[PDB]
């Protein structure tokens, strides 16, 4: 049967789904590793033991613990991002969609969810994979790991909670992948890794780490890098946070041994409901619990790695964003609402400077402040909306991903970059939003095509085009299909720098995405924030 | 006789000369000091012992001793502004240019050199007097003040070379124009005092010292302010230049008293000949013997007199010109030439700015080069000539004017600033030094009346409504007499464009990169250098 497939691990029964008047396989909820609870909280992956009998992977799985966001009760535009399934500690889980009739060896996909390492479900209607498996003819693998303090609580020393073990998790994934998917008619040697945000900088951190290496073959990172200033931690600053979840729930803190054990007692609605106070600062875009560079998965400082060429060589396609920074300063920002223009007082642009860049001493605020302001105007509250909207964007997405593509790009195989700006047709956000953190992603995965959705003709062509880039270059490690008359997206190159932009119009390229301001964020502001 | 005047000091018999197909009174080289030599080489400047008989007012005096720009030899351009006469220590005299017929209690203008405190000379063809005073019927005297070491060699303590008396001569001769200029039916309660550069850096420190405040009415500063960064040094700066003048001189170093008697046995040249040898670094728009913040002459820092509106409460007329750097990146930078377009390469940038901003720290060059470079479009030759154009400028001149202006209107009675960006029409310097520094000038003095320069007609236009804005303005505290030229305002800002096009108002002239300039990096340096 095309549906009953014999893993490694055991028997698994798939179900036949509908899309876009064909079908296709889909293999849903399959467990790749052992519960992670009780005594295991914390604790780094297990593989998920052998069972009999066949697994019915006809239905998502749970998703993991996690932060839930109810800003906006009822609006589609936030709770398409919240858990759409039961939450659990018991969520490890996988899921892959087949071409009807199996491949034999075909290209395979990984997707990572993104959610700044506190949330993001495997199950969400954009991540849908049917569409572009179907479409493009790949087989597409949805992973999961652990977020919030389930997935990094960080203790360096403990082998209880060393940190970083929701990594870990995708790279179990990325393992069973490896040893699994032949079965399902998947290429084990042509996978590529492909996620956004969180997601992205999860990708950007396996190229980095020497464990992970071997495990794909190639990358695609969205709206987010590695070397993100929200993406990672210090050991010292992760065992501080760990310790402050502790003195939140009034744990003993005499040794990592019984915090931990503490902890371990605990729900996990108790965790999440102090997740957010062990932060050091007020600030938008700064989650607790992420990567510790621990001189294990990450060997060196992330720098030194991107400096030395101590990472995987192979072909990258990588992306922003044209408004990145919206989505938080929408939620932490003062003067910011979806339901009005947000025109920004000099004022709030002030406290919002500071949200934004919160390790920066008063000069460092002096410096972004200059940067970003119109002096001739500075009481012009669109240019300061606009303004602290480029900040947010360009110090947490923009230009550590230029930083990431420029150096990687002196050691790798082919880098190819892009600028989605293409504003939905459909959005329910407010116009000044722009082109939202992550909604690119219904375009990766072929949601315009789709009619009752309501999105433009236009719109579907753009979706289609996007899908057969992110293939092809699967497939080849190029997002062009050679000798093809239709318009080519140029090598990123470290002499010219060419990117191109993503939407509806037809492609223009481009050379040195945001380097003005990139300049100032990657060489400039931190020269001046080490000075003293 | 009209020619022939009664002094306080003396009587003076001046030379009736054309100007127009007409004439007016000259009386040149008028002495309002002692001559300020041997013994008297450092020392604040003694009023003029009275004379007898006639003194003969008829021809320019000597210039005061000074470096001569040999950079380009024949050249109009560089030597028009060099000595046109003999230089001597014995130069402290003044010149008068009286309509004829004489009027009655007249507005006088006092014109001050500039030169970069170094060099400057009152008897230039650019600062020819008569068609301005002519023109508009206003009694015109240009001073002279000791440059270089000779009048700002600053030994603070010592009463022998105490530091700042070239503006001490200046204060003289102003004290004299007081004193005697109603009798050349000039109006002494009516006294506008201007200056370009450092000239006009001088008219602002007038403006700030008690001192000097009783002698003038009102002020026009031209391309220079009193906190420009050159304009003034600490009196321990001043000091460890004055000993390294000695050291560079093989002098005594072991008393200021034997330092100086070493000094004033050097002849002249000896002294000029060394004199950039003492400024601390390797840097261009700098000059080694300026005014020393004293306490004397200066109560307190400028800064805080500034603040604490400690200074003269009147009516301020001040601008700028387009491209007031490129003559020092000519003189002092590498890449750049009088004979060709002087693209810059991105070498000889960086090079450059440390060069324009020799204080900062690399974190401080870093932050200028950063807001001077286009980083989509770095080897633009062009575009780096133009920036690097516009640090010089911004930093010496612009930048430190719009501070001041900004400082003074909160507590003065009257602010009206302009921008000059007229490019003559018969400039003989190369099109990317654009309007140079010193040039707005020659239409302030009416040169473009004269027919034989050259000037197109709507060249004369202009210099004819600048003269009258600036003779209007010394008249009234207004350069309008009942297209508006606003007044500079704390909330508003507005200024003007002065060029031969209509006249267009703006507002917060080069804000942006003032912002940077006055806050800042003087914030990034005090933190980090
Ligand atoms: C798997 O679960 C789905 C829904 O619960 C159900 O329709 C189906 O019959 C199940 N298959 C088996 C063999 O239990
Ligand atoms: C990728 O690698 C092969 C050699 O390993 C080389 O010939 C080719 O030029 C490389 N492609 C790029 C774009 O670096
Ligand atoms: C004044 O001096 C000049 C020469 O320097 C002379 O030609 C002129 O006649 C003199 N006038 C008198 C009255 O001495
Ligand atoms: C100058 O002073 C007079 C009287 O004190 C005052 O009415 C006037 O407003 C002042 N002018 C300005 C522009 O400050
Ligand atoms: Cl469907
Ligand atoms: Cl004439």
Same mark, same amino acid.
């Given at each position: ?134 479409? #493009? ?58 996620? $956004? ?60 041994? #019984? ?15 102090? $997740? ?209 008359? $239709? ?8 002499? #010219? ?36």
């Amino acid at each position: 049967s095309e549906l009953l497939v014999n893993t490694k691990s055991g028997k698994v029964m798939g179900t036949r789904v509908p899309v876009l008047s064909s079908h296709i396989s889909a293999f849903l909820g399959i467990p790749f590793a052992e519960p992670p609870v009780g005594n295991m909280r914390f604790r780094r992956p297990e593989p998920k033991k052998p069972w009999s009998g066949v697994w019915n992977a006809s239905t998502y799985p749970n998703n993991c613990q996690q932060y839930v966001d109810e800003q906006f009760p009822g609006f589609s535009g936030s709770e398409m991002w919240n858990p759409n399934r039961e939450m659990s500690e018991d969520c490890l889980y996988l899921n892959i969609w087949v071409p009807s009739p199996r491949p034999k060896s075909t290209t395979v996909m990984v997707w990572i969810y993104g959610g700044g390492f506190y949330s993001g479900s495997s199950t969400l209607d954009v991540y849908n994979g049917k569409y572009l498996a179907y479409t #493009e003819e790949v087989v597409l693998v949805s992973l999961s790991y652990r977020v919030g303090a389930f997935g990094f609580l960080a203790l360096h020393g403990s082998q209880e909670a060393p940190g970083n073990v929701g990594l870990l998790d995708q790279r179990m994934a990325l393992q069973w992948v490896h040893d699994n998917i032949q079965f399902f008619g998947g290429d084990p040697k042509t996978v590529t890794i492909f996620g $956004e945000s969180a997601g992205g900088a999860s990708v950007g951190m396996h190229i980095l780490s020497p464990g992970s290496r071997d495990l794909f073959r190639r990358a695609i990172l969205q709206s987010g890098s590695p070397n993100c200033p929200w993406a990672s931690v210090s050991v010292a600053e992760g065992r501080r946070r760990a310790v402050e979840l502790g003195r939140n729930l009034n744990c003993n803190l005499n040794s990592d041994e #019984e915090l931990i054990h503490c902890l371990r007692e605990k729900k996990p609605q108790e965790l999440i409901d102090v $997740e957010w106070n062990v932060l050091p600062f007020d600030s938008i875009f700064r989650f607790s619990f992420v990567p510790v560079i621990d001189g294990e998965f990450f060997p060196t400082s992330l720098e030194s790695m991107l400096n030395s060429g101590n990472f995987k060589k192979t072909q990258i396609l990588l992306g922003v964003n044209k408004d990145e920074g919206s989505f938080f300063l929408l939620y932490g920002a003062p003067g910011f609402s979806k339901d009005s223009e947000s025109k920004i007082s000099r004022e709030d642009f002030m406290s919002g400077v500071k949200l934004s860049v919160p390790h920066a001493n008063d000069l460092g605020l002096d410096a972004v402040t200059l940067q970003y302001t119109d002096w001739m105007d500075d009481n012009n509250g669109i240019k300061n909306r606009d303004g602290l909207d480029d900040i947010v964007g360009d110090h947490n997405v923009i230009c550590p991903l230029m930083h990431f593509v420029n150096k990687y790009t002196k050691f790798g195989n082919g880098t190819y970059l892009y600028f989605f700006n293409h504003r939905a047709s459909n959005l329910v956000w407010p116009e000044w939003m722009g082109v939202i953190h992550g909604y690119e992603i219904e375009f990766v995965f072929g949601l315009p095509l789709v009619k009752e959705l309501n999105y433009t003709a236009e719109e579907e062509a753009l979706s289609r085009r996007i899908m057969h880039y992110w293939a092809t270059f699967a497939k080849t490690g190029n997002p062009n299909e050679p000798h093809s008359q $239709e318009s080519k997206w140029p090598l990123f190159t470290t002499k #010219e720098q060419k990117f191109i932009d993503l939407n509806t119009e037809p492609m223009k390229v481009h050379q040195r995405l945001r380097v003005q301001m990139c300049v100032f964020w990657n060489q400039f502001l931190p020269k001046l924030l080490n000075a003293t």
